[PDB]
Amino acid sequence: PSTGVELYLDLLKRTVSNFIYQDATHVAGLITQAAFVEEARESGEDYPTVAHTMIGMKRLNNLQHCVESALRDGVPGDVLETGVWRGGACIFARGILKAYDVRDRTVWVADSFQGFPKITDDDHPMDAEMNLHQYNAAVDLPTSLATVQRNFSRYGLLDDQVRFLPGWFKDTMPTAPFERLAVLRMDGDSYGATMDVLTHAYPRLSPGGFAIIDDYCIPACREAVHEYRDRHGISDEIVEIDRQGVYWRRSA
Amino acid sequence: PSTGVELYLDLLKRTVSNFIYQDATHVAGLITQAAFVEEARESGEDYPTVAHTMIGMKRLNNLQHCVESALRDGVPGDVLETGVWRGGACIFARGILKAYDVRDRTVWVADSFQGFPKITDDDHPMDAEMNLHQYNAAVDLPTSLATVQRNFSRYGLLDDQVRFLPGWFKDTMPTAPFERLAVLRMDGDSYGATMDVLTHAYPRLSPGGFAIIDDYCIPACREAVHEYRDRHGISDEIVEIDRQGVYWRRSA
Ligand SMILES: CC[C@H]1OC(=O)/C=C/[C@H](C)[C@@H](O[C@@H]2O[C@H](C)C[C@H](N(C)C)[C@H]2O)[C@@H](C)C[C@@H](C)C(=O)/C=C/C=C/[C@@H]1CO[C@@H]1O[C@H](C)[C@@H](O)[C@@H](OC)[C@H]1OC
Ligand SMILES: CC[C@H]1OC(=O)/C=C/[C@H](C)[C@@H](O[C@@H]2O[C@H](C)C[C@H](N(C)C)[C@H]2O)[C@@H](C)C[C@@H](C)C(=O)/C=C/C=C/[C@@H]1CO[C@@H]1O[C@H](C)[C@@H](O)[C@@H](OC)[C@H]1OC
Ligand SMILES: Nc1ncnc2c1ncn2[C@@H]1O[C@H](CSCC[C@H](N)C(=O)O)[C@@H](O)[C@H]1O
Ligand SMILES: Nc1ncnc2c1ncn2[C@@H]1O[C@H](CSCC[C@H](N)C(=O)O)[C@@H](O)[C@H]1O
Ligand SMILES: [Mg+2]
Ligand SMILES: [Mg+2]
């Protein structure tokens, strides 16, 4: 990075993922030690105790790629992340728009702001077995709307181009008041959250727009992706980002 | 802030002072609670447990003012900080040069890298009384050269335009290899450290350059400043920054 924009976006990635102060990770899943590990934060594989995003540098770089490509190529629409936790990825998205002085696109921040949902008999069997709800406390996942707003304000990026969609995706997505998306970033882990958002938000993704599946390594997530793509006859190349995420670019 | 440069430098200030994650302060001096207090970090009056600078937002803004004015006005010379702790103010200084693609100026980082010196019989009576050495561990002040280098690297700002002057100022300043300074930032607290640097570095401060006295609220520091100014017939207006620091701009 040499230009002001390049320096800003580089620093913003380093800051939301907190390579700057390198906070400890929660101990959960495959992470058995609390110590900061560079490689884990680089590929977004730990559970930061303090950092504002857990998606890591490779998926932040991907988000930047997708937003910049949409801007460059004149792909119409907003940016939506479904599953935002402390807000770091959406903060970075808003910063990208800020850096290029884009005044006519919005970052939509969608989340229960309550962590993973309690499982009921309505849930897909794979979601029920996985029961993501059980690790809400373990990785400090429930994060209120007020806290996420607090966090945008800390980098000076809380403004009218950031809009919030509080609630469960099955409830908020069908009538969410955006008309077009240039980037749809899905990070809700489950079959349910993935299918909710593909069903109700993907049709508003512009041709040339990007669909990012953060959690593709999770079998329930991946099953929703393939079910949805099969149903709609979507054959757009699935491109791998790191050990967790993939994306495709919508051809039509 | 709206340009890439403005956004970058704004974020860099917020990051080195850690308004982003808002670390606790040490409980020392007039600070009686550990909790982050916005006003205290804004004015640089606490003792951050994690942040890379303790000078606060107002004195960061002042440093930016002085460096940008020197660049704008074509004042020749490098930037020197005497007393750098974890390096945050010097990191920010390097960032300013980076933002404007300045390739012909250096940030000089001068410190014992060991905290305040033990008092000897040679010390000024006010320094002996104050005995700053007593506070080293309490506010985690001793910070090694390796750690400071580590810290610049985290921002991507460790390069050949950052040079280090390890040692006591009375030892390092008289023969420090720089020829001219555009900004001289003094943050060594004591009569001794202030007089060391005024004596041996100030004569290399260019006309139009800036002399920043971070610690002017400390009587021993202020005593050195007026003794030095009186000796050299310096009458340049002393301008307040906040409740600790002042600066003047050199006319003669
Ligand atoms: C710590 C929280 C995570 O828990 C996990 O990562 C939980 C992984 C469990 C422990 C695994 O199960 C174990 O596999 C071993 C090979 C054998 C072991 N024996 C005893 C049976 C067995 O316990 C995995 C394989 C369980 C299966 C069902 C699975 O795929 C679980 C996924 C759960 C992911 C949980 C949510 O993590 C999310 O992962 C995404 C990839 C990230 O992007 C991020 O998404 C927002 C993250 O959210 C915190
Ligand atoms: C905890 C470490 C600091 O300890 C301090 O901050 C020391 C504060 C002493 C205790 C103060 O004295 C007290 O003032 C009260 C209002 C009343 C109280 N009664 C009993 C009289 C009285 O004790 C101050 C006013 C003493 C005078 C001599 C002074 O200015 C002290 C300077 C010593 C500063 C110590 C070093 O702090 C440095 O202060 C600079 C202003 C900062 O920019 C920063 O510089 C690098 C910082 O370094 C950690
Ligand atoms: N069905 C659902 N409806 C709404 N939010 C959901 C949901 N299932 C999971 N979530 C939310 O999905 C998020 C997954 S963590 C998301 C990580 C985030 N993108 C980052 O940058 O770090 C959590 O905040 C959780 O509250
Ligand atoms: N006589 C002396 N010679 C060299 N370094 C000294 C010194 N007296 C004090 N110091 C150093 O002065 C520093 C004061 S703290 C400086 C704070 C720093 N400018 C910031 O941005 O946060 C300490 O790092 C200490 O090691
Ligand atoms: Mg994920
Ligand atoms: Mg000071």
Do A94 and A106 contact (CB within 8 A), yes or no?
no
Taking CA atoms, B12 is separated from A50, B45, B154, in Å, by 18, 19, 12
Cα B10 off chain centre by: 18
The whole-angstrom separation of Cα B79 and Cα B165 is 13
Pocket test for ligand 4, best of B187, B191, B198, B212 (most atoms within 8 A of CB): B187
Residues in chain B: 252
Taking CA atoms, B154 is separated from A45, B67, B224, in Å, by 19, 22, 36
Return left, alpha or beta for B115; rule: phi > 0 is left, psi -120 to 50 is alpha, else beta.
left
**A54 labelled binding-site residue:** yes
CA proximity to B239, closest of B231, B230, B250, B252:
B250
| Tokens found for residue B145 | 């050269």
Angle at B78 between CA B144 and CA B97, to 5 degrees: 85
The whole-angstrom separation of Cα A17 and Cα A59 is 11
The whole-angstrom separation of Cα B110 and Cα B88 is 13
Q: Which residues contact A226 (CB under 8 A, 6 or more apart)?
A: none
Do A245 and A237 contact (CB within 8 A), yes or no?
no
* Main-chain phi, psi angles of B241, to 5 degrees: -100, -55
Give residue limits of the domains in chain B: 1-252
B11 contacts A12? CB cut-off 8 A: yes
Closest to B11 (Cβ–Cβ): which among A3, A8, A52?
A8
Write out chain A residues lying below 8 Å of B19, CB-based. Answer: 154
Do B27 and B34 contact (CB within 8 A), yes or no?
yes
- B99 alpha carbon to ligand 4 midpoint, in Å? 26
Closest to A21 (Cβ–Cβ): which among B5, B8, B50?
B50
Residue ranges of the binding site of B = 53-54, 81-85, 111-115, 169, 187-188, 214-215
B8 contacts A7? CB cut-off 8 A: yes
Taking CA atoms, A37 is separated from A48, A57, A200, B23, B185, in Å, by 11, 13, 37, 20, 35
Do A59 and A163 contact (CB within 8 A), yes or no?
no
**Structure resolution, Å:** 1.5
Do A97 and A125 contact (CB within 8 A), yes or no?
no
Strands B107-111 and B162-166: parallel
Taking CA atoms, B249 is separated from A231, B30, B147, B230, B236, in Å, by 71, 31, 32, 16, 7
Long-range contacts of B145-154 (CB under 8 A, 24+ apart): B145/B113, B147/B86, B148/B84, B148/B86, B148/B87, B148/B90, B148/B109, B148/B111, B148/B113, B151/B52, B151/B86, B151/B87, B151/B88, B151/B91, B152/B87, B152/B90, B152/B91, B152/B94, B154/A14, B154/A19, B154/A20, B154/A22
CA proximity to A186, closest of A207, A201, A171, A175:
A201
- State the sign of the Cα–Cα–Cα–Cα dihedral B138, B144, B148, B153: negative
- State the sign of the Cα–Cα–Cα–Cα dihedral A77, A81, A86, A89: negative
Task: Please work out whether the CB of residue B44 comes within 6 Å of at least one atom of ligand 4.
Answer: no
B10 contacts A6? CB cut-off 8 A: no
Do A235 and A245 contact (CB within 8 A), yes or no?
no
The whole-angstrom separation of Cα A19 and Cα B116 is 29
Taking CA atoms, B26 is separated from A24, B50, B57, B206, in Å, by 20, 10, 18, 38
The whole-angstrom separation of Cα B13 and Cα A150 is 18
Taking CA atoms, A95 is separated from A12, A41, A64, B92, B189, in Å, by 8, 20, 10, 20, 38
* Ligand 2, atom 7, residue with closest C-alpha: B29
Amino acid identity, residue A5?
V
Which of B18, B21, B94, B147 has the most A C-beta neighbours within 10 Å, making it the best mutation to test the interface with A? Answer: B21
Residue owning tokens 């104050």: B130
Write out chain B residues lying below 8 Å of A3, CB-based. Answer: 4
Strands A205-213 and A239-240: unpaired
- What is the DSSP secondary-structure string of B75-99? ---EEEEE--TTSHHHHHHHHHHHH
The whole-angstrom separation of Cα B238 and Cα B217 is 13
Do B227 and B117 contact (CB within 8 A), yes or no?
no
The whole-angstrom separation of Cα A30 and Cα A35 is 13
Residue owning tokens 């309690």: A118
B6 contacts A11? CB cut-off 8 A: no
The whole-angstrom separation of Cα B89 and Cα A7 is 18
CA proximity to B1, closest of A160, A94, A99, A154:
A99
Taking CA atoms, A90 is separated from A79, A148, A183, B163, in Å, by 9, 10, 11, 37
The whole-angstrom separation of Cα A225 and Cα A241 is 16
* Ligand 1, atom 22, residue with closest C-alpha: A29
| Tokens found for residue B198 | 């005024």
DSSP bridge pairs for A213? A186, A246
Do B102 and B77 contact (CB within 8 A), yes or no?
no
Taking CA atoms, B52 is separated from B38, B40, B56, in Å, by 16, 15, 10
Long-range contacts of A68-76 (CB under 8 A, 24+ apart): A68/A96, A69/A210, A70/A182, A70/A183, A70/A206, A70/A208, A70/A209, A70/A210, A71/A100, A71/A102, A71/A182, A73/A208, A75/A182, A75/A206, A75/A207, A75/A208, A75/A209, A76/A180, A76/A182, A76/A206
The whole-angstrom separation of Cα A6 and Cα A17 is 17
* Ligand 2, atom 14, residue with closest C-alpha: B30
Cα A139 off chain centre by: 16
Pocket test for ligand 4, best of B109, B189, B199, B241 (most atoms within 8 A of CB): B189
Strands A205-213 and A181-186: parallel
Which ligand minimizes its atom distance to the CA of B62? Answer: 4
The whole-angstrom separation of Cα A15 and Cα A11 is 6
Q: Which residues contact A104 (CB under 8 A, 6 or more apart)?
A: none
